[PDB]
PDB file of C-alpha atoms (C1' of nucleotides) in Angstrom:
ATOM      1  CA  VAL N   1      -2.301  29.101  36.705  1.00 48.51           C
ATOM      2  CA  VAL N   2      -3.102  31.392  33.780  1.00 49.15           C
ATOM      3  CA  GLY N   3      -3.014  35.153  33.525  1.00 47.56           C
ATOM      4  CA  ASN N   4      -0.600  38.040  33.944  1.00 48.56           C
ATOM      5  CA  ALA N   5       2.548  36.238  35.206  1.00 46.74           C
ATOM      6  CA  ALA N   6       3.941  39.089  37.248  1.00 45.96           C
ATOM      7  CA  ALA N   7       1.618  38.363  40.251  1.00 43.04           C
ATOM      8  CA  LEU N   8       3.071  34.851  40.770  1.00 41.86           C
ATOM      9  CA  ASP N   9       3.771  35.727  44.430  1.00 38.78           C
ATOM     10  CA  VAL N  10      -0.016  35.859  45.113  1.00 35.76           C
ATOM     11  CA  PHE N  11      -0.436  32.349  43.791  1.00 35.28           C
ATOM     12  CA  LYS N  12       2.647  31.284  45.712  1.00 35.28           C
ATOM     13  CA  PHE N  13       1.130  32.659  48.943  1.00 34.14           C
ATOM     14  CA  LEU N  14      -2.203  31.045  48.220  1.00 35.64           C
ATOM     15  CA  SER N  15      -0.437  27.779  47.213  1.00 34.10           C
ATOM     16  CA  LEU N  16       0.928  27.119  50.733  1.00 36.60           C
ATOM     17  CA  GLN N  17      -2.469  26.526  52.433  1.00 37.91           C
ATOM     18  CA  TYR N  18      -2.333  22.813  51.407  1.00 41.69           C
ATOM     19  CA  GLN N  19       1.291  22.166  52.358  1.00 43.12           C
ATOM     20  CA  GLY N  20       0.553  22.015  56.056  1.00 39.73           C
ATOM     21  CA  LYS N  21      -2.771  23.715  56.618  1.00 38.72           C
ATOM     22  CA  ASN N  22      -6.575  23.634  56.236  1.00 38.78           C
ATOM     23  CA  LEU N  23      -7.346  27.164  55.065  1.00 37.43           C
ATOM     24  CA  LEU N  24      -5.854  27.819  51.633  1.00 36.93           C
ATOM     25  CA  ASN N  25      -5.807  24.441  49.936  1.00 39.55           C
ATOM     26  CA  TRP N  26      -8.961  23.652  51.989  1.00 36.15           C
ATOM     27  CA  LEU N  27     -10.423  27.183  51.981  1.00 35.34           C
ATOM     28  CA  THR N  28     -13.826  26.014  50.719  1.00 31.83           C
ATOM     29  CA  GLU N  29     -14.800  25.414  54.355  1.00 31.20           C
ATOM     30  CA  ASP N  30     -13.184  25.798  57.810  1.00 28.16           C
ATOM     31  CA  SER N  31     -14.038  29.352  58.700  1.00 29.94           C
ATOM     32  CA  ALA N  32     -11.850  28.855  61.845  1.00 33.10           C
ATOM     33  CA  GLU N  33      -9.037  27.884  59.374  1.00 33.66           C
ATOM     34  CA  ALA N  34      -9.817  31.096  57.421  1.00 30.50           C
ATOM     35  CA  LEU N  35      -9.773  33.317  60.551  1.00 31.02           C
ATOM     36  CA  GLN N  36      -6.734  31.454  62.029  1.00 29.23           C
ATOM     37  CA  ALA N  37      -4.293  34.189  60.799  1.00 30.45           C
ATOM     38  CA  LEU N  38      -6.348  37.267  59.731  1.00 29.75           C
ATOM     39  CA  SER N  39      -6.837  39.157  63.049  1.00 30.77           C
ATOM     40  CA  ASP N  40      -8.070  42.263  61.164  1.00 29.86           C
ATOM     41  CA  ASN N  41     -11.616  43.710  60.875  1.00 31.67           C
ATOM     42  CA  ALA N  42     -14.433  41.573  59.530  1.00 32.24           C
ATOM     43  CA  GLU N  43     -14.973  43.671  56.405  1.00 32.99           C
ATOM     44  CA  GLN N  44     -11.405  43.526  55.268  1.00 32.14           C
ATOM     45  CA  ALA N  45     -11.281  39.825  56.203  1.00 32.85           C
ATOM     46  CA  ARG N  46     -14.379  39.128  54.149  1.00 31.33           C
ATOM     47  CA  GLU N  47     -12.980  41.040  51.169  1.00 29.47           C
ATOM     48  CA  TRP N  48      -9.658  39.188  51.463  1.00 28.06           C
ATOM     49  CA  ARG N  49     -11.448  35.865  51.615  1.00 29.20           C
ATOM     50  CA  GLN N  50     -13.498  36.777  48.566  1.00 29.37           C
ATOM     51  CA  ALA N  51     -10.371  37.801  46.654  1.00 30.68           C
ATOM     52  CA  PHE N  52      -8.661  34.547  47.641  1.00 31.79           C
ATOM     53  CA  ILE N  53     -11.640  32.443  46.614  1.00 34.49           C
ATOM     54  CA  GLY N  54     -11.673  34.357  43.316  1.00 37.99           C
ATOM     55  CA  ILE N  55      -8.522  32.733  41.901  1.00 36.48           C
ATOM     56  CA  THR N  56     -10.184  29.545  40.646  1.00 39.29           C
ATOM     57  CA  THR N  57     -13.396  31.106  39.261  1.00 38.66           C
ATOM     58  CA  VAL N  58     -14.860  32.652  36.104  1.00 39.40           C
ATOM     59  CA  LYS N  59     -13.392  35.599  34.306  1.00 43.61           C
ATOM     60  CA  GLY N  60     -16.592  37.741  34.510  1.00 45.53           C
ATOM     61  CA  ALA N  61     -19.006  36.406  31.906  1.00 44.91           C
ATOM     62  CA  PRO N  62     -19.440  33.131  30.021  1.00 42.61           C
ATOM     63  CA  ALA N  63     -17.692  34.067  26.814  1.00 43.16           C
ATOM     64  CA  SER N  64     -16.356  32.095  23.912  1.00 42.66           C
ATOM     65  CA  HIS N  65     -14.667  33.497  20.827  1.00 44.91           C
ATOM     66  CA  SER N  66     -14.991  33.264  17.033  1.00 46.04           C
ATOM     67  CA  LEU N  67     -11.623  31.354  17.004  1.00 46.54           C
ATOM     68  CA  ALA N  68     -12.556  28.871  19.752  1.00 44.91           C
ATOM     69  CA  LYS N  69     -13.749  25.639  17.977  1.00 42.92           C
ATOM     70  CA  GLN N  70     -17.477  25.443  18.459  1.00 46.44           C
ATOM     71  CA  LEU N  71     -19.574  22.567  17.113  1.00 49.31           C
ATOM     72  CA  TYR N  72     -23.043  21.230  16.732  1.00 48.57           C
ATOM     73  CA  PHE N  73     -24.021  17.819  18.213  1.00 48.33           C
ATOM     74  CA  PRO N  74     -27.204  16.241  17.100  1.00 46.25           C
ATOM     75  CA  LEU N  75     -29.796  15.044  19.616  1.00 48.98           C
ATOM     76  CA  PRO N  76     -31.930  11.872  19.430  1.00 46.92           C
ATOM     77  CA  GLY N  77     -34.775  13.113  17.187  1.00 47.88           C
ATOM     78  CA  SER N  78     -34.531  16.713  18.206  1.00 46.38           C
ATOM     79  CA  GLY N  79     -32.353  19.800  17.644  1.00 46.19           C
ATOM     80  CA  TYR N  80     -28.869  20.636  18.758  1.00 47.63           C
ATOM     81  CA  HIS N  81     -26.561  21.404  21.602  1.00 50.62           C
ATOM     82  CA  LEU N  82     -23.676  23.673  20.655  1.00 50.07           C
ATOM     83  CA  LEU N  83     -20.340  22.298  21.994  1.00 48.46           C
ATOM     84  CA  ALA N  84     -17.202  24.295  22.671  1.00 49.25           C
ATOM     85  CA  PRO N  85     -14.425  21.888  23.570  1.00 48.71           C
ATOM     86  CA  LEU N  86     -11.428  23.265  25.395  1.00 51.62           C
ATOM     87  CA  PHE N  87      -7.877  22.132  25.857  1.00 53.84           C
ATOM     88  CA  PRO N  88      -7.236  19.877  28.875  1.00 53.78           C
ATOM     89  CA  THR N  89      -4.068  21.474  30.256  1.00 52.21           C
ATOM     90  CA  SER N  90      -4.156  19.514  33.484  1.00 53.36           C
ATOM     91  CA  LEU N  91      -4.647  16.096  31.808  1.00 52.84           C
ATOM     92  CA  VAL N  92      -1.906  16.769  29.297  1.00 52.21           C
ATOM     93  CA  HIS N  93       0.516  17.848  32.026  1.00 52.10           C
ATOM     94  CA  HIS N  94      -0.276  14.561  33.788  1.00 52.34           C
ATOM     95  CA  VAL N  95       0.413  12.639  30.587  1.00 50.64           C
ATOM     96  CA  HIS N  96       3.657  14.537  29.953  1.00 49.95           C
ATOM     97  CA  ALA N  97       4.755  13.619  33.483  1.00 47.26           C
ATOM     98  CA  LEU N  98       3.850   9.992  32.759  1.00 46.14           C
ATOM     99  CA  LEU N  99       5.700   9.987  29.434  1.00 45.46           C
ATOM    100  CA  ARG N 100       8.815  11.436  30.969  1.00 47.42           C
ATOM    101  CA  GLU N 101       8.639   8.785  33.674  1.00 48.09           C
ATOM    102  CA  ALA N 102       8.307   6.180  30.858  1.00 50.34           C
ATOM    103  CA  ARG N 103      10.947   7.569  28.458  1.00 52.82           C
ATOM    104  CA  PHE N 104      13.490   9.365  30.605  1.00 53.08           C
ATOM    105  CA  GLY N 105      14.730   9.803  34.182  1.00 52.82           C
ATOM    106  CA  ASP N 106      17.014   7.206  35.704  1.00 51.65           C
ATOM    107  CA  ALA N 107      15.151   3.890  36.212  1.00 53.53           C
ATOM    108  CA  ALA N 108      13.865   3.428  32.640  1.00 54.74           C
ATOM    109  CA  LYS N 109      17.212   4.514  31.287  1.00 55.82           C
TER     110      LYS N 109
ATOM    111  C1'   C K   1     -24.706  21.447  10.099  1.00 54.78           C
ATOM    112  C1'   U K   2     -17.679  17.637  10.730  1.00 56.37           C
ATOM    113  C1'   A K   3     -11.337  20.547  17.226  1.00 56.93           C
ATOM    114  C1'   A K   4     -16.406  23.842  12.257  1.00 55.21           C
ATOM    115  C1'   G K   5     -15.019  28.128   8.521  1.00 56.58           C
ATOM    116  C1'   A K   6      -9.192  30.897   6.270  1.00 54.49           C
ATOM    117  C1'   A K   7      -3.827  30.083   4.400  1.00 55.52           C
ATOM    118  C1'   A K   8       2.606  31.183  -1.141  1.00 54.04           C
ATOM    119  C1'   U K   9       8.116  28.709   3.081  1.00 54.45           C
ATOM    120  C1'   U K  10      11.366  31.349  -0.100  1.00 53.24           C
ATOM    121  C1'   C K  11      16.082  32.653  -2.687  1.00 50.11           C
ATOM    122  C1'   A K  12      21.688  30.895  -3.432  1.00 49.57           C
ATOM    123  C1'   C K  13      25.646  27.161  -2.832  1.00 50.47           C
ATOM    124  C1'   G K  14      32.518  22.878  -5.293  1.00 50.60           C
ATOM    125  C1'   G K  15      32.431  17.422  -0.508  1.00 48.36           C
ATOM    126  C1'   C K  16      37.633  16.748  -1.624  1.00 47.48           C
ATOM    127  C1'   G K  17      42.680  14.636  -0.989  1.00 48.06           C
ATOM    128  C1'   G K  18      45.010   9.302   0.091  1.00 45.49           C
ATOM    129  C1'   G K  19      44.933   3.832   0.705  1.00 46.31           C
ATOM    130  C1'   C K  20      47.809  -4.081  -0.211  1.00 48.76           C
ATOM    131  C1'   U K  21      42.178  -6.998   3.648  1.00 48.58           C
ATOM    132  C1'   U K  22      45.169 -11.292   4.421  1.00 47.35           C
ATOM    133  C1'   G K  23      46.960 -16.548   5.645  1.00 49.21           C
ATOM    134  C1'   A K  24      44.569 -22.080   6.236  1.00 49.23           C
ATOM    135  C1'   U K  25      40.960 -25.909   5.390  1.00 49.17           C
ATOM    136  C1'   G K  26      37.814 -33.487   4.022  1.00 50.54           C
ATOM    137  C1'   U K  27      30.807 -32.091   3.578  1.00 48.70           C
ATOM    138  C1'   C K  28      29.946 -37.236   4.658  1.00 49.35           C
ATOM    139  C1'   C K  29      27.269 -42.004   5.279  1.00 48.20           C
ATOM    140  C1'   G K  30      21.926 -44.333   3.419  1.00 48.18           C
ATOM    141  C1'   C K  31      17.310 -44.659   0.589  1.00 47.92           C
ATOM    142  C1'   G K  32      11.156 -48.324  -3.930  1.00 49.61           C
ATOM    143  C1'   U K  33       7.903 -42.345  -5.845  1.00 48.89           C
ATOM    144  C1'   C K  34       3.841 -45.630  -7.286  1.00 45.43           C
ATOM    145  C1'   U K  35      -1.461 -46.514  -8.738  1.00 45.28           C
ATOM    146  C1'   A K  36      -5.543 -45.277 -13.227  1.00 46.82           C
ATOM    147  C1'   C K  37      -7.263 -42.297 -17.600  1.00 47.35           C
ATOM    148  C1'   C K  38     -11.432 -41.402 -24.979  1.00 45.89           C
ATOM    149  C1'   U K  39      -8.571 -34.325 -26.281  1.00 48.30           C
ATOM    150  C1'   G K  40     -14.755 -37.564 -30.140  1.00 50.85           C
ATOM    151  C1'   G K  41     -18.442 -30.894 -31.942  1.00 51.92           C
ATOM    152  C1'   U K  42     -18.336 -29.586 -38.106  1.00 51.76           C
ATOM    153  C1'   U K  43     -10.346 -26.117 -33.847  1.00 48.82           C
ATOM    154  C1'   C K  44     -16.339 -22.204 -37.708  1.00 51.31           C
ATOM    155  C1'   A K  45     -24.553 -22.802 -40.107  1.00 51.38           C
ATOM    156  C1'   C K  46     -17.597 -22.146 -43.523  1.00 51.88           C
ATOM    157  C1'   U K  47     -11.616 -21.326 -45.511  1.00 49.27           C
ATOM    158  C1'   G K  48     -10.996 -23.035 -51.762  1.00 49.82           C
ATOM    159  C1'   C K  49     -16.136 -22.265 -53.141  1.00 46.62           C
ATOM    160  C1'   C K  50     -22.043 -20.689 -60.010  1.00 42.48           C
ATOM    161  C1'   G K  51     -24.362 -14.134 -57.744  1.00 42.08           C
ATOM    162  C1'   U K  52     -19.557 -10.766 -52.841  1.00 40.36           C
ATOM    163  C1'   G K  53     -25.963  -9.297 -53.584  1.00 38.88           C
ATOM    164  C1'   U K  54     -30.859 -15.126 -46.842  1.00 41.99           C
ATOM    165  C1'   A K  55     -31.055 -17.277 -54.618  1.00 40.35           C
ATOM    166  C1'   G K  56     -27.170 -21.977 -56.722  1.00 39.20           C
ATOM    167  C1'   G K  57     -23.414 -26.532 -59.346  1.00 40.61           C
ATOM    168  C1'   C K  58     -20.766 -25.714 -54.202  1.00 42.55           C
ATOM    169  C1'   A K  59     -13.050 -31.518 -52.518  1.00 45.09           C
ATOM    170  C1'   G K  60     -21.046 -31.214 -47.794  1.00 47.62           C
TER     171        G K  60
END
RNA sequence: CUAAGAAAUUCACGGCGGGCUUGAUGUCCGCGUCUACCUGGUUCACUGCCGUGUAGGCAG
């Protein structure tokens, strides 16, 4: 999770729908699993569901920066696609977990 | 049209003081190395060489 790190309680509340449920970790479907705890009006329920779905979405516009490592890749006989590679945070956290399994812990030691 | 394009790491400094490495010792026994060969351009179209001077008597 990336952003202002003072609202970590909201991500903690939205991060319990997969540890024993089918409405927060599986909130892409299951409208019964979405309405299983709301009990409020339909407008406030729809606004809360939209706000909960907008936690793994875009920031507002597709925007790069002048300090963001853009590149040209050449096509077979034609012009170009511009390529803006990003940093794989998830993959490198997976590989840091695998390297601490392989270098440290208790069994490898 | 390249994880694209940019970039001052800087100043200064006491490593010192001491010290027993010792004692002992079997390297031994044995053996088939043969077979054959042209250094022959002028080891200079040259060192001493009538003129060093494409002319010459020139240990040719």
